[PDB]
Protein backbone atom coordinates (compact mmCIF):
# COMPACT_ATOMS: atom_id res chain seq x y z
CA UNK A 1 0.00 0.00 0.00
CA UNK A 2 2.16 2.84 -1.39
CA UNK A 3 0.72 6.32 -1.96
CA UNK A 4 2.49 8.73 -4.30
CA UNK A 5 2.18 12.44 -5.15
CA UNK A 6 3.47 14.25 -8.30
CA UNK A 7 3.68 18.04 -8.86
CA UNK A 8 6.03 20.40 -10.77
CA UNK A 9 9.51 21.20 -9.36
CA UNK A 10 8.43 24.83 -9.37
CA UNK A 11 4.91 26.10 -8.65
CA UNK A 12 3.20 29.33 -9.78
CA UNK A 13 0.84 31.80 -8.14
CA UNK A 14 -2.71 32.56 -9.40
CA UNK A 15 -2.24 29.85 -12.05
CA UNK A 16 -3.93 26.46 -12.01
CA UNK A 17 -1.64 23.52 -11.40
CA UNK A 18 -2.25 19.77 -11.27
CA UNK A 19 -1.34 17.26 -8.57
CA UNK A 20 -1.48 13.65 -9.72
CA UNK A 21 -2.36 11.33 -6.84
CA UNK A 22 -1.84 7.57 -6.91
CA UNK A 23 -2.68 4.61 -4.72
CA UNK A 24 -0.51 1.58 -5.52
CA UNK A 25 -1.52 -1.89 -4.27
CA UNK A 26 -4.71 -0.74 -2.53
CA UNK A 27 -8.40 -1.71 -2.41
CA UNK A 28 -11.69 0.23 -2.22
CA UNK A 29 -12.31 3.98 -2.31
CA UNK A 30 -9.49 6.05 -0.78
CA UNK A 31 -10.49 9.58 0.37
CA UNK A 32 -7.84 12.20 -0.38
CA UNK A 33 -7.64 15.76 0.93
CA UNK A 34 -4.91 18.04 -0.43
CA UNK A 35 -3.76 21.10 1.53
CA UNK A 36 -1.06 23.63 0.62
CA UNK A 37 0.80 25.36 3.47
CA UNK A 38 3.57 27.94 3.88
CA UNK A 39 6.93 26.31 4.69
CA UNK A 40 8.42 28.00 7.80
CA UNK A 41 5.28 27.40 9.92
CA UNK A 42 1.57 26.78 9.32
CA UNK A 43 -0.71 29.39 7.72
CA UNK A 44 -2.64 27.34 5.11
CA UNK A 45 -2.71 28.70 1.54
CA UNK A 46 -5.77 27.83 -0.62
CA UNK A 47 -6.05 24.14 0.40
CA UNK A 48 -9.38 22.38 -0.40
CA UNK A 49 -10.18 20.52 -3.66
CA UNK A 50 -11.57 17.04 -3.05
CA UNK A 51 -11.24 13.71 -4.89
CA UNK A 52 -12.08 10.05 -4.35
CA UNK A 53 -9.81 7.47 -6.01
CA UNK A 54 -11.98 4.57 -7.22
CA UNK A 55 -10.94 0.97 -8.11
CA UNK A 56 -12.89 1.36 -11.37
CA UNK A 57 -10.51 3.94 -12.85
CA UNK A 58 -7.47 2.15 -11.32
CA UNK A 59 -6.70 4.31 -8.24
CA UNK A 60 -5.40 7.24 -10.29
CA UNK A 61 -6.72 10.80 -10.50
CA UNK A 62 -5.77 14.43 -9.97
CA UNK A 63 -6.52 17.61 -8.08
CA UNK A 64 -6.59 21.04 -9.73
CA UNK A 65 -5.48 23.84 -7.39
CA UNK A 66 -4.65 27.55 -7.57
CA UNK A 67 -2.16 29.16 -5.15
CA UNK A 68 -3.09 32.79 -4.31
CA UNK A 69 -0.55 35.57 -3.67
CA UNK A 70 -0.01 35.92 0.10
CA UNK A 71 2.96 38.28 0.66
CA UNK A 72 13.94 38.69 -0.51
CA UNK A 73 14.72 35.15 -1.66
CA UNK A 74 13.13 31.73 -2.32
CA UNK A 75 9.46 31.12 -1.53
CA UNK A 76 8.45 27.52 -0.75
CA UNK A 77 5.23 25.64 0.09
CA UNK A 78 4.68 22.42 2.06
CA UNK A 79 2.13 20.34 0.14
CA UNK A 80 0.28 17.63 2.09
CA UNK A 81 -1.78 14.70 0.75
CA UNK A 82 -3.73 12.54 3.23
CA UNK A 83 -4.41 9.02 1.89
CA UNK A 84 -6.79 7.89 4.61
CA UNK A 85 -4.65 8.44 7.71
CA UNK A 86 -1.31 8.49 5.82
CA UNK A 87 0.33 11.93 5.43
CA UNK A 88 2.65 12.50 2.46
CA UNK A 89 4.25 15.98 2.62
CA UNK A 90 6.52 17.72 0.07
CA UNK A 91 8.25 21.11 0.22
CA UNK A 92 8.11 22.72 -3.24
CA UNK A 93 9.58 25.90 -4.76
CA UNK A 94 7.30 28.77 -5.79
CA UNK A 95 7.79 31.27 -8.64
CA UNK A 96 6.47 34.84 -8.64
CA UNK A 97 6.73 34.78 -12.49
CA UNK A 98 3.42 36.07 -13.90
CA UNK A 99 4.04 35.04 -17.53
CA UNK A 100 5.63 36.84 -20.48
CA UNK A 101 5.95 40.41 -21.70
CA UNK A 102 6.77 40.97 -25.34
CA UNK A 103 7.45 44.51 -26.52
CA UNK A 104 6.91 45.86 -30.03
CA UNK A 105 8.18 49.17 -31.43
CA UNK A 106 6.92 50.54 -34.73
CA UNK A 107 10.53 50.86 -36.01
CA UNK A 108 14.11 49.66 -35.45
CA UNK A 109 15.61 53.12 -35.54
CA UNK A 110 14.53 56.70 -34.83
CA UNK A 111 15.83 60.27 -35.22
CA UNK A 112 15.78 62.88 -32.42
CA UNK A 113 12.46 64.76 -32.48
CA UNK A 114 10.39 61.74 -33.42
CA UNK A 115 7.89 59.43 -31.74
CA UNK A 116 8.66 55.91 -30.49
CA UNK A 117 5.38 54.00 -30.73
CA UNK A 118 5.32 50.78 -28.81
CA UNK A 119 3.13 48.12 -27.38
CA UNK A 120 3.56 45.61 -24.56
CA UNK A 121 1.81 42.27 -24.86
CA UNK A 122 0.86 40.82 -21.45
CA UNK A 123 0.45 37.04 -21.52
CA UNK A 124 0.47 34.21 -18.97
CA UNK A 125 2.68 31.09 -18.99
CA UNK A 126 0.28 29.61 -21.59
CA UNK A 127 0.75 32.59 -23.93
CA UNK A 128 -2.79 33.73 -23.20
CA UNK A 129 -3.82 37.35 -22.28
CA UNK A 130 -3.81 38.45 -18.64
CA UNK A 131 -4.58 41.73 -16.89
CA UNK A 132 -1.80 42.57 -14.45
CA UNK A 133 -0.01 45.80 -13.64
CA UNK A 134 3.19 46.33 -15.61
CA UNK A 135 6.12 48.69 -15.04
CA UNK A 136 7.77 49.93 -18.26
CA UNK A 137 10.94 52.09 -18.62
CA UNK A 138 12.64 53.68 -21.65
CA UNK A 139 16.39 54.05 -20.98
CA UNK A 140 19.25 55.78 -22.80
CA UNK A 141 22.53 54.16 -23.96
CA UNK A 142 23.98 55.02 -20.52
CA UNK A 143 20.97 53.24 -18.95
CA UNK A 144 19.27 56.27 -17.42
CA UNK A 145 15.43 56.12 -17.34
CA UNK A 146 14.01 58.79 -19.64
CA UNK A 147 10.34 57.75 -19.49
CA UNK A 148 8.70 55.64 -16.77
CA UNK A 149 5.16 54.11 -16.84
CA UNK A 150 3.17 51.85 -14.54
CA UNK A 151 -0.07 50.58 -16.10
CA UNK A 152 -2.66 47.79 -15.93
CA UNK A 153 -3.61 45.56 -18.85
CA UNK A 154 -6.83 44.52 -17.09
CA UNK A 155 -9.71 44.37 -19.58
CA UNK A 156 -7.32 45.42 -22.44
CA UNK A 157 -7.13 41.99 -24.15
CA UNK A 158 -3.38 41.75 -23.34
CA UNK A 159 -2.29 44.85 -25.28
CA UNK A 160 -0.73 48.03 -23.89
CA UNK A 161 -0.06 50.77 -26.47
CA UNK A 162 2.32 53.56 -25.40
CA UNK A 163 4.31 56.34 -27.06
CA UNK A 164 7.33 58.52 -26.40
CA UNK A 165 8.59 61.75 -27.98
CA UNK A 166 12.38 61.71 -28.39
CA UNK A 167 13.72 65.25 -27.55
CA UNK A 168 15.75 67.15 -30.20
CA UNK A 169 18.80 66.94 -27.90
CA UNK A 170 19.39 63.30 -26.99
CA UNK A 171 22.36 60.91 -26.88
CA UNK A 172 22.63 58.68 -29.96
CA UNK A 173 23.08 54.93 -29.55
CA UNK A 174 21.31 51.77 -28.42
CA UNK A 175 18.24 52.64 -26.36
CA UNK A 176 16.20 50.09 -24.46
CA UNK A 177 12.66 49.43 -23.29
CA UNK A 178 12.64 47.34 -20.13
CA UNK A 179 9.36 45.98 -18.75
CA UNK A 180 8.34 43.84 -15.78
CA UNK A 181 5.18 42.59 -14.09
CA UNK A 182 4.61 44.34 -10.77
CA UNK A 183 4.62 41.08 -8.79
CA UNK A 184 7.83 39.79 -10.45
CA UNK A 185 10.40 42.64 -10.65
CA UNK A 186 13.35 40.22 -10.82
CA UNK A 187 12.33 39.11 -14.29
CA UNK A 188 12.75 41.97 -16.74
CA UNK A 189 11.83 41.74 -20.41
CA UNK A 190 13.76 44.10 -22.69
CA UNK A 191 13.79 45.25 -26.30
CA UNK A 192 16.17 47.62 -28.11
CA UNK A 193 16.07 50.50 -30.56
CA UNK A 194 18.66 52.79 -32.15
CA UNK A 195 18.57 56.60 -32.06
CA UNK A 196 20.64 58.13 -34.85
CA UNK A 197 20.49 61.12 -37.15
CA UNK A 198 19.79 59.87 -40.67
CA UNK A 199 17.75 60.18 -43.86
CA UNK A 200 16.18 57.11 -45.51
CA UNK A 201 18.22 55.46 -48.26
CA UNK A 202 16.50 54.81 -51.62
CA UNK A 203 18.07 51.37 -52.20
CA UNK A 204 19.30 48.31 -50.29
CA UNK A 205 22.60 46.44 -50.44
CA UNK A 206 22.78 42.69 -49.83
CA UNK A 207 26.18 41.14 -49.15
CA UNK A 208 26.26 37.38 -49.73
CA UNK A 209 29.16 34.87 -49.43
CA UNK A 210 28.89 31.88 -51.82
CA UNK A 211 29.22 29.54 -48.83
CA UNK A 212 28.06 30.58 -45.36
CA UNK A 213 31.55 29.87 -44.02
CA UNK A 214 35.21 29.88 -44.99
CA UNK A 215 37.03 26.54 -45.32
CA UNK A 216 40.61 27.36 -44.22
CA UNK A 217 42.24 25.27 -46.98
CA UNK A 218 40.13 26.72 -49.80
CA UNK A 219 42.54 28.20 -52.34
CA UNK A 220 39.71 30.19 -53.97
CA UNK A 221 39.40 32.30 -50.81
CA UNK A 222 36.07 33.83 -49.73
CA UNK A 223 33.83 34.82 -52.65
CA UNK A 224 31.12 37.43 -52.07
CA UNK A 225 28.34 38.79 -54.32
CA UNK A 226 27.01 42.30 -53.76
CA UNK A 227 23.51 42.98 -54.88
CA UNK A 228 21.91 46.40 -54.89
CA UNK A 229 18.36 47.32 -55.79
CA UNK A 230 16.02 50.21 -55.14
CA UNK A 231 13.36 49.79 -52.50
CA UNK A 232 10.71 49.85 -55.27
CA UNK A 233 12.34 46.85 -57.03
CA UNK A 234 14.52 48.18 -59.85
CA UNK A 235 18.19 47.30 -60.33
CA UNK A 236 20.97 49.68 -59.24
CA UNK A 237 23.94 50.92 -61.33
CA UNK A 238 26.94 52.12 -59.34
CA UNK A 239 30.27 51.39 -57.69
CA UNK A 240 30.94 49.32 -54.55
CA UNK A 241 33.81 49.66 -52.10
CA UNK A 242 34.38 46.35 -50.35
CA UNK A 243 36.60 45.56 -47.36
CA UNK A 244 37.09 42.35 -45.36
CA UNK A 245 38.20 41.81 -41.76
CA UNK A 246 38.63 39.18 -39.00
CA UNK A 247 36.77 38.85 -35.68
CA UNK A 248 37.99 37.05 -32.53
CA UNK A 249 35.29 37.95 -29.97
CA UNK A 250 34.91 41.72 -29.41
CA UNK A 251 38.15 42.35 -31.36
CA UNK A 252 38.12 43.27 -35.06
CA UNK A 253 41.08 43.11 -37.47
CA UNK A 254 40.63 45.06 -40.72
CA UNK A 255 42.60 43.75 -43.71
CA UNK A 256 43.27 46.93 -45.78
CA UNK A 257 44.84 44.97 -48.67
CA UNK A 258 41.41 43.36 -49.18
CA UNK A 259 39.89 46.75 -50.16
CA UNK A 260 38.36 46.55 -53.63
CA UNK A 261 36.49 48.98 -55.88
CA UNK A 262 34.16 47.16 -58.26
CA UNK A 263 31.37 48.10 -60.65
CA UNK A 264 27.78 47.28 -59.74
CA UNK A 265 26.32 46.41 -63.13
CA UNK A 266 22.67 45.28 -63.44
CA UNK A 267 22.35 45.44 -59.63
CA UNK A 268 25.19 42.98 -59.14
CA UNK A 269 28.92 42.80 -58.37
CA UNK A 270 31.50 40.17 -57.51
CA UNK A 271 34.41 40.32 -55.06
CA UNK A 272 36.96 37.87 -53.61
CA UNK A 273 38.99 37.75 -50.40
CA UNK A 274 42.19 35.98 -51.47
CA UNK A 275 43.77 33.40 -49.19
CA UNK A 276 47.19 35.10 -49.33
CA UNK A 277 45.86 38.56 -48.40
CA UNK A 278 43.93 36.94 -45.54
CA UNK A 279 47.03 35.22 -44.16
CA UNK A 280 49.44 38.12 -44.76
CA UNK A 281 46.98 40.23 -42.72
CA UNK A 282 47.53 38.19 -39.54
CA UNK A 283 51.37 38.14 -39.56
CA UNK A 284 49.98 29.08 -39.34
CA UNK A 285 46.49 28.77 -40.84
CA UNK A 286 44.45 26.60 -38.44
CA UNK A 287 44.70 29.20 -35.65
CA UNK A 288 42.01 31.13 -37.52
CA UNK A 289 39.53 28.25 -37.06
CA UNK A 290 36.96 29.46 -34.56
CA UNK A 291 37.36 33.06 -35.71
CA UNK A 292 35.04 34.81 -38.13
CA UNK A 293 35.23 37.09 -41.17
CA UNK A 294 33.15 40.17 -41.84
CA UNK A 295 32.62 42.03 -45.11
CA UNK A 296 31.72 45.69 -45.41
CA UNK A 297 30.36 47.07 -48.69
CA UNK A 298 29.66 50.68 -49.55
CA UNK A 299 27.64 51.32 -52.74
CA UNK A 300 27.49 54.71 -54.50
CA UNK A 301 24.94 55.33 -57.24
CA UNK A 302 26.34 56.69 -60.51
CA UNK A 303 24.39 59.88 -59.74
CA UNK A 304 26.41 60.16 -56.49
CA UNK A 305 23.21 61.37 -54.88
CA UNK A 306 22.79 58.30 -52.63
CA UNK A 307 25.17 55.94 -50.87
CA UNK A 308 24.48 52.83 -48.80
CA UNK A 309 26.78 50.91 -46.48
CA UNK A 310 26.09 47.29 -45.56
CA UNK A 311 27.86 44.60 -43.55
CA UNK A 312 27.85 40.83 -43.47
CA UNK A 313 29.51 39.61 -40.28
CA UNK A 314 29.79 36.16 -38.68
CA UNK A 315 31.33 34.16 -41.48
CA UNK A 316 32.90 31.31 -39.46
CA UNK A 317 36.36 30.08 -40.36
CA UNK A 318 36.09 26.29 -40.16
CA UNK A 319 37.59 22.89 -41.00
CA UNK A 320 34.14 21.33 -41.57
CA UNK A 321 30.87 22.55 -43.15
CA UNK A 322 28.90 20.87 -40.35
CA UNK A 323 28.69 20.79 -36.54
CA UNK A 324 27.38 17.85 -34.53
CA UNK A 325 25.60 18.73 -31.27
CA UNK A 326 24.56 16.28 -28.53
CA UNK A 327 22.42 18.82 -26.67
CA UNK A 328 19.13 16.96 -27.38
CA UNK A 329 20.59 13.62 -26.27
CA UNK A 330 20.20 12.16 -22.73
CA UNK A 331 23.54 11.99 -20.84
CA UNK A 332 22.55 8.84 -18.95
CA UNK A 333 21.87 5.35 -20.30
CA UNK A 334 20.22 2.14 -19.11
CA UNK A 335 22.79 -0.71 -19.27
CA UNK A 336 21.42 -3.68 -21.23
CA UNK A 337 18.98 -1.49 -23.16
CA UNK A 338 19.06 0.61 -26.39
CA UNK A 339 20.50 4.12 -26.17
CA UNK A 340 18.98 6.77 -28.44
CA UNK A 341 20.91 9.75 -29.75
CA UNK A 342 19.07 12.79 -31.07
CA UNK A 343 21.99 14.11 -33.09
CA UNK A 344 21.51 17.74 -34.09
CA UNK A 345 23.55 18.94 -37.06
CA UNK A 346 23.94 22.57 -38.07
CA UNK A 347 25.61 24.69 -40.69
CA UNK A 348 28.40 26.78 -39.07
CA UNK A 349 26.03 29.79 -38.66
CA UNK A 350 23.74 27.83 -36.32
CA UNK A 351 21.05 26.92 -38.89
CA UNK A 352 19.98 23.24 -38.95
CA UNK A 353 21.67 21.19 -41.70
CA UNK A 354 19.08 19.14 -43.57
CA UNK A 355 19.49 15.79 -45.36
CA UNK A 356 22.92 14.97 -43.85
CA UNK A 357 24.10 11.38 -43.15
CA UNK A 358 25.29 10.70 -39.59
CA UNK A 359 26.64 7.41 -38.22
CA UNK A 360 28.02 6.11 -34.92
CA UNK A 361 31.69 5.08 -34.95
CA UNK A 362 32.35 1.33 -34.44
CA UNK A 363 28.83 0.06 -35.14
CA UNK A 364 29.62 2.31 -38.06
CA UNK A 365 27.85 1.96 -41.41
CA UNK A 366 24.27 2.07 -39.94
CA UNK A 367 23.59 5.61 -41.26
CA UNK A 368 20.66 7.99 -40.77
CA UNK A 369 19.61 11.21 -42.56
CA UNK A 370 18.78 14.39 -40.62
CA UNK A 371 15.23 15.80 -40.83
CA UNK A 372 13.93 19.29 -41.74
CA UNK A 373 14.94 20.64 -38.35
CA UNK A 374 18.32 18.87 -38.75
CA UNK A 375 17.98 16.06 -36.23
CA UNK A 376 18.58 12.33 -36.75
CA UNK A 377 17.73 9.40 -34.49
CA UNK A 378 20.47 6.82 -34.00
CA UNK A 379 20.06 3.77 -31.74
CA UNK A 380 22.85 1.68 -30.25
CA UNK A 381 22.52 -1.39 -28.01
CA UNK A 382 24.41 -1.42 -24.71
CA UNK A 383 25.85 -4.31 -22.75
CA UNK A 384 24.72 -4.72 -19.08
CA UNK A 385 27.93 -3.20 -17.69
CA UNK A 386 27.92 -0.27 -15.26
CA UNK A 387 30.56 1.63 -17.25
CA UNK A 388 30.77 5.16 -18.76
CA UNK A 389 29.71 4.88 -22.40
CA UNK A 390 31.69 7.03 -24.85
CA UNK A 391 30.00 7.73 -28.20
CA UNK A 392 31.38 9.20 -31.41
CA UNK A 393 29.06 10.28 -34.20
CA UNK A 394 30.50 11.45 -37.52
CA UNK A 395 29.12 12.98 -40.71
CA UNK A 396 29.05 10.68 -43.74
CA UNK A 397 28.03 13.32 -46.30
CA UNK A 398 29.40 12.21 -49.67
CA UNK A 399 31.11 14.86 -51.86
CA UNK A 400 32.88 15.83 -48.63
CA UNK A 401 36.25 14.17 -47.92
CA UNK A 402 37.13 12.29 -44.69
CA UNK A 403 38.82 15.43 -43.27
CA UNK A 404 35.83 17.63 -44.22
CA UNK A 405 33.33 15.43 -42.32
CA UNK A 406 32.31 16.51 -38.81
CA UNK A 407 33.01 14.61 -35.57
CA UNK A 408 31.81 14.83 -31.94
CA UNK A 409 32.16 12.63 -28.85
CA UNK A 410 29.92 12.44 -25.77
CA UNK A 411 29.83 10.45 -22.56
CA UNK A 412 26.75 8.91 -20.96
CA UNK A 413 26.83 7.52 -17.43
CA UNK A 414 24.85 4.48 -16.24
CA UNK A 415 21.43 4.96 -14.63
CA UNK A 416 22.00 3.55 -11.14
CA UNK A 417 19.34 1.14 -9.88
CA UNK A 418 17.57 1.24 -6.47
CA UNK A 419 19.47 -1.61 -4.77
CA UNK A 420 21.77 -3.01 -7.47
CA UNK A 421 18.62 -4.68 -8.81
CA UNK A 422 18.86 -4.13 -12.59
CA UNK A 423 15.31 -2.88 -13.05
CA UNK A 424 15.09 -0.31 -15.84
CA UNK A 425 12.55 1.66 -17.86
CA UNK A 426 13.30 3.02 -21.34
CA UNK A 427 11.10 5.36 -23.41
CA UNK A 428 11.44 5.87 -27.17
CA UNK A 429 9.82 7.92 -29.99
CA UNK A 430 10.53 8.57 -33.70
CA UNK A 431 12.21 11.94 -34.45
CA UNK A 432 10.14 13.03 -37.49
CA UNK A 433 8.53 16.51 -37.93
CA UNK A 434 5.74 16.48 -35.32
CA UNK A 435 2.81 18.80 -35.99
CA UNK A 436 -0.30 19.22 -33.81
CA UNK A 437 -3.24 17.07 -34.97
CA UNK A 438 -0.97 14.05 -35.27
CA UNK A 439 -0.63 10.87 -33.21
CA UNK A 440 2.74 10.02 -31.65
CA UNK A 441 3.68 6.50 -30.53
CA UNK A 442 5.53 6.20 -27.22
CA UNK A 443 7.38 2.91 -26.73
CA UNK A 444 7.81 1.55 -23.20
CA UNK A 445 10.66 -0.91 -22.96
CA UNK A 446 11.13 -2.99 -19.82
CA UNK A 447 14.30 -4.59 -18.43
CA UNK A 448 14.21 -6.86 -15.39
CA UNK A 449 14.60 -10.57 -14.73
CA UNK A 450 12.05 -13.21 -15.81
CA UNK A 451 11.32 -14.00 -12.14
CA UNK A 452 10.26 -10.46 -11.26
CA UNK A 453 8.77 -9.23 -14.57
CA UNK A 454 5.15 -10.33 -13.86
CA UNK A 455 4.71 -7.83 -10.99
CA UNK A 456 4.49 -4.80 -13.33
CA UNK A 457 0.88 -4.32 -14.48
CA UNK A 458 1.14 -0.63 -15.53
CA UNK A 459 3.26 2.47 -16.10
CA UNK A 460 2.28 5.96 -15.02
CA UNK A 461 3.17 8.68 -17.53
CA UNK A 462 3.24 12.46 -17.25
CA UNK A 463 3.16 15.23 -19.86
CA UNK A 464 4.91 18.46 -18.90
CA UNK A 465 4.49 21.49 -21.17
CA UNK A 466 5.30 25.16 -20.51
CA UNK A 467 6.00 24.50 -16.79
CA UNK A 468 2.82 22.59 -15.94
CA UNK A 469 1.24 19.13 -16.12
CA UNK A 470 -0.62 18.91 -19.42
CA UNK A 471 -1.89 15.31 -19.31
CA UNK A 472 -1.41 12.25 -17.09
CA UNK A 473 -2.53 8.64 -17.48
CA UNK A 474 -1.65 4.95 -17.29
CA UNK A 475 -0.17 2.62 -19.88
CA UNK A 476 -1.31 -0.93 -19.05
CA UNK A 477 0.98 -3.95 -19.31
CA UNK A 478 0.51 -7.73 -19.26
CA UNK A 479 3.27 -10.19 -18.17
CA UNK A 480 5.80 -11.20 -20.86
CA UNK A 481 5.44 -7.94 -22.84
CA UNK A 482 8.73 -6.25 -23.66
CA UNK A 483 7.15 -3.38 -25.59
CA UNK A 484 3.85 -1.65 -25.00
CA UNK A 485 2.90 1.25 -27.30
CA UNK A 486 1.03 4.38 -26.23
CA UNK A 487 -0.81 6.39 -28.92
CA UNK A 488 -0.51 9.99 -27.68
CA UNK A 489 -2.63 12.62 -29.49
CA UNK A 490 -0.69 15.86 -30.16
CA UNK A 491 -2.62 19.15 -29.92
CA UNK A 492 -1.76 22.88 -30.11
CA UNK A 493 -1.40 22.67 -26.30
CA UNK A 494 1.85 20.76 -26.85
CA UNK A 495 3.36 23.61 -28.90
CA UNK A 496 6.98 24.48 -28.54
CA UNK A 497 8.07 21.15 -26.95
CA UNK A 498 7.17 18.71 -24.15
CA UNK A 499 8.60 16.09 -21.78
CA UNK A 500 7.22 12.62 -21.23
CA UNK A 501 8.26 11.12 -17.89
CA UNK A 502 7.09 7.60 -17.01
CA UNK A 503 7.55 5.25 -14.05
CA UNK A 504 6.62 1.86 -12.64
CA UNK A 505 6.74 0.66 -9.05
CA UNK A 506 7.02 -2.66 -7.19
CA UNK A 507 8.10 -4.30 -3.93
CA UNK A 508 11.20 -6.20 -5.11
CA UNK A 509 13.81 -8.51 -3.56
CA UNK A 510 13.96 -8.35 0.27
CA UNK A 511 11.05 -6.20 1.48
CA UNK A 512 11.95 -2.84 -0.08
CA UNK A 513 9.67 -0.77 -2.34
CA UNK A 514 11.21 0.56 -5.60
CA UNK A 515 10.41 3.25 -8.22
CA UNK A 516 11.92 2.97 -11.72
CA UNK A 517 11.72 6.00 -14.05
CA UNK A 518 12.67 7.30 -17.53
CA UNK A 519 12.02 10.50 -19.49
CA UNK A 520 12.10 11.72 -23.08
CA UNK A 521 12.00 15.25 -24.53
CA UNK A 522 9.96 15.83 -27.72
CA UNK A 523 9.97 18.77 -30.15
CA UNK A 524 6.75 20.11 -31.74
CA UNK A 525 6.69 22.18 -34.95
CA UNK A 526 6.50 25.95 -34.35
CA UNK A 527 3.38 27.82 -35.38
CA UNK A 528 0.72 30.02 -33.80
CA UNK A 529 -1.95 28.13 -31.88
CA UNK A 530 -4.33 29.91 -34.23
CA UNK A 531 -3.60 31.69 -37.48
CA UNK A 532 -3.00 35.22 -38.81
CA UNK A 533 -2.46 36.24 -42.42
CA UNK A 534 -2.25 39.69 -44.04
CA UNK A 535 -2.80 40.09 -47.77
CA UNK A 536 -3.96 42.60 -50.35
CA UNK A 537 -7.10 42.30 -52.44
CA UNK A 538 -6.03 41.26 -55.97
CA UNK A 539 -2.32 41.61 -56.96
CA UNK A 540 1.77 47.96 -58.55
CA UNK A 541 -0.12 50.77 -56.77
CA UNK A 542 0.63 54.47 -57.23
CA UNK A 543 1.35 56.81 -54.33
CA UNK A 544 -1.85 57.94 -52.56
CA UNK A 545 -3.79 55.05 -54.11
CA UNK A 546 -6.43 53.30 -52.03
CA UNK A 547 -6.10 49.55 -51.67
CA UNK A 548 -7.82 46.84 -49.67
CA UNK A 549 -6.07 45.16 -46.79
CA UNK A 550 -7.38 41.67 -46.06
CA UNK A 551 -6.72 40.15 -42.58
CA UNK A 552 -7.47 36.47 -41.93
CA UNK A 553 -7.28 35.31 -38.32
CA UNK A 554 -9.16 33.82 -35.38
CA UNK A 555 -12.70 34.87 -34.44
CA UNK A 556 -12.86 37.52 -31.71
CA UNK A 557 -9.15 38.27 -32.06
CA UNK A 558 -7.73 41.72 -31.55
CA UNK A 559 -5.27 42.58 -34.35
CA UNK A 560 -2.69 45.36 -34.06
CA UNK A 561 -0.89 46.68 -37.18
CA UNK A 562 2.12 48.69 -38.44
CA UNK A 563 3.49 49.68 -41.81
CA UNK A 564 7.22 50.48 -42.01
CA UNK A 565 9.20 51.87 -44.92
CA UNK A 566 11.70 49.13 -45.90
CA UNK A 567 14.29 51.93 -46.04
CA UNK A 568 14.29 51.70 -42.24
CA UNK A 569 15.51 48.09 -42.18
CA UNK A 570 18.38 49.01 -44.52
CA UNK A 571 19.68 51.17 -41.68
CA UNK A 572 18.72 48.71 -38.95
CA UNK A 573 17.04 45.27 -39.06
CA UNK A 574 17.72 44.24 -35.42
CA UNK A 575 15.20 43.42 -32.67
CA UNK A 576 12.09 42.79 -34.84
CA UNK A 577 9.21 40.82 -33.26
CA UNK A 578 8.62 37.35 -34.71
CA UNK A 579 6.56 34.33 -33.61
CA UNK A 580 9.65 32.10 -33.26
CA UNK A 581 11.48 34.64 -31.06
CA UNK A 582 8.41 34.30 -28.81
CA UNK A 583 8.75 30.46 -28.68
CA UNK A 584 12.45 30.63 -27.91
CA UNK A 585 11.56 32.75 -24.87
CA UNK A 586 8.95 30.15 -23.89
CA UNK A 587 11.67 27.46 -24.15
CA UNK A 588 14.18 29.39 -22.02
CA UNK A 589 11.48 29.36 -19.32
CA UNK A 590 11.14 25.53 -19.28
CA UNK A 591 11.45 24.21 -15.72
CA UNK A 592 12.71 20.83 -16.97
CA UNK A 593 16.46 21.01 -17.38
CA UNK A 594 17.70 17.99 -19.43
CA UNK A 595 16.97 16.12 -22.71
CA UNK A 596 15.88 13.13 -20.60
CA UNK A 597 16.69 10.23 -18.23
CA UNK A 598 18.76 10.75 -15.07
CA UNK A 599 21.23 9.57 -12.43
CA UNK A 600 18.53 7.49 -10.74
CA UNK A 601 14.72 7.49 -10.34
CA UNK A 602 14.70 10.76 -8.36
CA UNK A 603 17.21 12.26 -10.81
CA UNK A 604 14.84 11.44 -13.67
CA UNK A 605 11.80 13.16 -12.13
CA UNK A 606 13.76 16.20 -10.96
CA UNK A 607 15.52 16.92 -14.31
CA UNK A 608 12.14 16.75 -16.12
CA UNK A 609 10.73 19.35 -13.68
CA UNK A 610 8.73 17.10 -11.33
CA UNK A 611 8.64 16.26 -7.64
CA UNK A 612 8.06 12.71 -6.48
CA UNK A 613 7.12 11.77 -2.92
CA UNK A 614 5.84 8.39 -1.79
CA UNK A 615 4.26 7.23 1.49
CA UNK A 616 7.03 4.64 1.89
CA UNK A 617 9.92 7.11 1.84
CA UNK A 618 11.24 7.30 -1.74
CA UNK A 619 11.44 10.89 -2.96
CA UNK A 620 12.98 13.50 -5.22
CA UNK A 621 15.51 15.74 -3.47
CA UNK A 622 14.51 19.30 -2.68
CA UNK A 623 14.96 21.83 -5.46
CA UNK A 624 15.91 25.23 -4.01
CA UNK A 625 17.09 26.77 -7.29
CA UNK A 626 14.82 28.70 -9.69
CA UNK A 627 17.14 28.29 -12.68
CA UNK A 628 18.72 25.18 -14.21
CA UNK A 629 22.32 24.22 -13.28
CA UNK A 630 25.24 25.56 -15.36
CA UNK A 631 27.46 23.15 -17.39
Amino acid sequence: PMYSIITPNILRLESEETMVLEAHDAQGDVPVTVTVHDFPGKKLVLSSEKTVLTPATNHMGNVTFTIPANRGRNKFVTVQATFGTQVVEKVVLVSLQSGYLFIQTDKTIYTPGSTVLYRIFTVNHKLLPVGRTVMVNIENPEGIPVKQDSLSSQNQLGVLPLSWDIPELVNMGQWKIRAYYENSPQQVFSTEFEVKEYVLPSFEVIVEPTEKFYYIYNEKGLEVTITARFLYGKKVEGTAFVIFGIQDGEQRISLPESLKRIPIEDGSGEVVLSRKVLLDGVQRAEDLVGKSLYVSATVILHSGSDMVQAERSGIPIVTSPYQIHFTKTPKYFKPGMPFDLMVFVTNPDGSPAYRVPVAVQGEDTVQSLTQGDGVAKLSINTHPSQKPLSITVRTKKQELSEAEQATRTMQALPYSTVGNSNNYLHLSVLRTELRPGETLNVNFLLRMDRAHEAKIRYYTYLIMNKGRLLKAGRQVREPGQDLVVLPLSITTDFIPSFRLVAYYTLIGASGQREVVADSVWVDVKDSCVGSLVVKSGQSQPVPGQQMTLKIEGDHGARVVLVAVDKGVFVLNKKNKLTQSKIWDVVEKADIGCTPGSGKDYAGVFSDAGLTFTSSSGQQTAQRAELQCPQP
Partner: peptide, 13 residues
Amino acid sequence: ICVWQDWGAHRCT
Protein backbone atom coordinates in the same frame (compact mmCIF):
# COMPACT_ATOMS: atom_id res chain seq x y z
CA ILE B 1 16.94 -3.40 -31.63
CA CYS B 2 17.24 -5.49 -28.43
CA VAL B 3 17.39 -5.73 -24.61
CA TRP B 4 19.90 -8.00 -22.84
CA GLN B 5 17.63 -10.41 -20.94
CA ASP B 6 16.22 -13.95 -21.09
CA TRP B 7 12.52 -13.21 -21.71
CA GLY B 8 10.39 -11.08 -24.07
CA ALA B 9 10.05 -10.64 -27.84
CA HIS B 10 13.10 -8.34 -28.07
CA ARG B 11 15.89 -10.43 -26.54
CA CYS B 12 19.43 -9.81 -27.81
CA THR B 13 20.70 -12.34 -30.42
